[PDB]
Amino acid sequence: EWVPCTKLGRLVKAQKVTSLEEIFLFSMPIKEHQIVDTLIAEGQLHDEMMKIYPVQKATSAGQRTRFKAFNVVGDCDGHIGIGARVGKEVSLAIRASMIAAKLNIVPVRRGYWGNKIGEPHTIPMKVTGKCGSVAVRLVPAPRGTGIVAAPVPKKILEFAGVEDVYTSSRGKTRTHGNLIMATFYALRKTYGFLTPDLWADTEPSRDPTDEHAELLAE
């Protein structure tokens, strides 16, 4: 049973927040993973384990082995999240990484290569994400090319909802902890790029907590 501990969790439980778009718009952090389970419909948040590998810390008698788990979450329709957690046992790491992945969900802007008919199918502009030595570059592609990418970025992009994209990589891509995060940062950056379609000014609106301050007072 979920008993919220933050104001945003209380507003989500009270149903006065109906989408993740409202949280994204005001840049509010998500501290309880149940918010994402609530705001995304049943059976529409796909998860997957991306990589599990051991890490060792040397000790005066041998070494201590823990496990790092990387989890991807997404609705295949413009929302993606990456979680990475360490645990003494594999199952603990997997569960914690699923929760962390749900916590780190982000919007992905999708666009068109040429003519704008149908749903957006590709990224709206060239983007690059870097983590360590690994950099992943996403290039818009026409319809029908699919995801021309290595398997790990391919899986992440599939969970993000991108159908056609050219991809280039550099650095030590076998460092998969860095590759996953580099792809995530490339995707997260699609909504920060100012396009002529976003030149028109916006009316600033009050935050959910501002408008439901009295409700959260009780």
């Binding site: 666009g111 709206p124 502009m125 818009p140 790029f193 100012l194 002529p196 030149w199």
Partner: protein
């Protein structure tokens, strides 16, 4: 020494836009710099700008709105036939939906879309988006 006035000006503009300034001083100026600025202005990427006369190569103060992501010069000014526009857009522009390659042509300095409409080639000056 300074070898390209246009490259210097466009690097200055890109630095000022990257650091969030609203005005930038350009020095020295030339006719080609003014035409490039006017091409950027025609598409709304910069605001109003003023040419200061010093009886020398002048100075320009450009008013920057937040629309300009990056502008830069292409050196050397490569030849571009009418069939090379797609290649340059693929190579140097963020997408086919926006952004411009600026060219100098015998019909004058213009962006790539207007040049393709006039069916003229020329030398590539730079880009902005």
């Amino acid at each position: 020494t300074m070898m390209s006035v246009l490259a210097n000006a466009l690097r200055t503009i890109a630095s000022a836009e990257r650091r969030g300034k609203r005005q930038v001083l350009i020095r020295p100026s030339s006719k080609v710099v003014v035409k490039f600025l006017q091409v950027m202005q025609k598409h709304g990427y910069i605001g109003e700008f003023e040419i200061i006369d010093d009886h020398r190569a002048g100075k320009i103060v450009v008013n920057l709105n937040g629309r300009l992501n990056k502008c830069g010069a292409i050196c050397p000014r490569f030849d571009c036939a009418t069939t090379d526009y797609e290649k340059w857009m693929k190579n140097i522009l963020p997408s086919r939906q926006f952004g411009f390659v600026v060219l100098t042509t015998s019909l004058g300095i213009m962006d790539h879309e207007e040049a393709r409409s006039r069916n003229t080639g020329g030398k590539v000056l730079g880009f902005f988006y």
